[PDB]
């Protein structure tokens with residue numbers, strides 16, 4: 299079997315992407331943030347504290363003839379951005395772009411932090427990192443991809459995010475019309491539960507490529523590209539007026555600038571992120587300064603190839619016994 303679903307930016311800056319997911323019988327459609335950096339499928343629900351719901355569509359398991367409460371199981375997650383959520387666990391029929399998994403763990407939120415409440419467009423998350431990061435306790439649950447994996451024509455899923463436009467998540471197949479050139483694969487370490495790999499270097503604009511190993515994770519649930527301070531400073535030094543701002547939380551630059559591209563290595567292959575993708579957006583509508591799409595990973599503890607980097611590529615998350623990650627230009 300296969301699945302294909304369109305993912306759409308939640309706003310004019312691509313702060314996050316939402317993909318419609320059908321849960322239960324009859325179908326209840328929620329717009330979830332597909333996150334290759336986490337492993338819990340959680341939703342706003344009929345159990346969520348009313349004061350913490352502000353416009354989200356909720357999952358109501360009592361209206362699903364296929365929902366089954368997983369008694370004694372709870373979940374609680376904290377993300378890198380300081381946000382969090384927790385609740386109870388059901389299993390139900392979950393479909394993504396025509397691909398159906400029966401008995402998928404659907405984590406019903408009882409509590410969500412203010413960051414989730416303020417994003418009316420995100421009804422929950424669908425985790426796509428390794429199932430070893432799932433927070434369901436005591437019984438750890440599998441991701442939607444892990445559960446689907448056996449029934450798919452091939453154990454893979456692909457991310458094809460758009461820049462200020464819709465994109466596609468496909469499960470079980472490779473669309474050969476979605477990229478230019480070929481898909482270059484690279485080794486993945488599953489030791490931390492992430493799609494962790496090592497980039498072979500970088501180039502700033504038309505500069506000479508610098509061969510240097512950069513370990514990082516392919517994370518669709520992170521908005522920006524977070525790389526070591528050395529790389530990031532070499533990039534922003536090419537932009538007049540660029541500087542790190544403590545009040546804004548990272549590199550800003552005058553919105554007047556047209557930015558250089560940024561190339562990252564995948565083995566002997568090269569993925570080029572256009573300058574416009576790195577011009578993330580103005581710090582406010584009408585502001586003098588714009589926020590950088592490439593930021594330092596120094597405070598985080600891990601480099602993150604987030605949406606700014608991933609939207610410049612067709613990305614294959616190969617979930618075979620020994621996982622690998624593929625990148626193609628587009």
Ligand SMILES: NCCN1CCOCC1
Nearest residue numbers: 313314412413414416417
């Ligand atoms: N609510 C703050 C976090 N979110 C994350 C996703 O995009 C919009 C901002």
